[PDB]
């Protein structure tokens, strides 16, 4: 992960993270990744290893350099604040944002 | 051709993201990932190629065997069925990187 260490002017809109990242050999590339592919809402908490958090979460924001903040519905249907560190699994690979397992 | 599974190993599915470790012509290997949500559609509960966005209406994605995406998806009438699709149809590995083909 650790995309934030090579990237700049990151933004979250709905489920999409977009950033501008330093390419391996120099210069910059801009790319987007749909976080809905890899994050789920488990009882009001954003978690890795699932998908479709956006179905039941709203008001997504980038907090600081690398955190996705949102309000997600608990099983009781109460919106609650939740955050997840995108640096856990999102890498910058030659200036392009990619999900990383290992 | 697709057929990434013959070039790759240690494959996994998390949300809509396929990760796999694929052979490099230099004699090494590269771990990469692809968002299958760009290329797979939920059509009335069945996973199909020639579309996108299946994660919005499916759940419990899993890799079955070496190359099958399995999931539970909502029909147009909003009931869940189990469905599968052979990722080897269109997912290829080119020099250690997963790519969509044709």
What would you say this structure looks like, in words?
- The structure is a homodimer of 102-residue chains.
- The first copy, chain A, has 102 residues and is mainly β.
- Helix content of chain A is 0%, strand content 57%.
- Chain A has strands at 7-13, 16-22, 28-34, 39-42, 45-48, 57-63, 67-73, 79-85, 90-93, 96-99.
- In chain A, a hairpin with a 5-residue loop joins strand 7 (67-73) and strand 8.
- The first copy, chain A, starts with 6 loop residues before the first strand and ends with a strand.
- The first copy, chain A, has a single domain (1-102), classed as HIV-inactivating Protein, Cyanovirin-n, CATH 2.30.60.
- In chain A, the strands form four sheets. The first copy, chain A, has a three-stranded antiparallel beta sheet, with no helix packed on it. Chain A has a three-stranded antiparallel beta sheet with strand order 6-7-8, with no helix packed on it.
- Chains A and B meet through loops of A and strand 2, strand 3 and strand 6 of B.
- Chain A: This is Cyanovirin-N.
């Amino acid at each position: 992960g650790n995309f934030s260490q090579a990237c700049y002017n990151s933004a979250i809109q709905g489920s999409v993270l977009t950033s501008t990242c330093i390419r391996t050999n120099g210069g910059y590339n801009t790319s987007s990744i749909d976080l809905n592919s890899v994050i789920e809402n488990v009882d009001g908490s954003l978690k890795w290893q699932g998908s479709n958090f956006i179905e039941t979460c709203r008001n997504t924001q980038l907090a600081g350099s690398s955190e996705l903040a949102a309000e997600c519905k608990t099983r009781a249907q109460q919106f609650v604040s939740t955050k997840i560190n995108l640096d856990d699994h999102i890498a910058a690979i030659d200036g392009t944002l990619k999900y990383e397992l290992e």
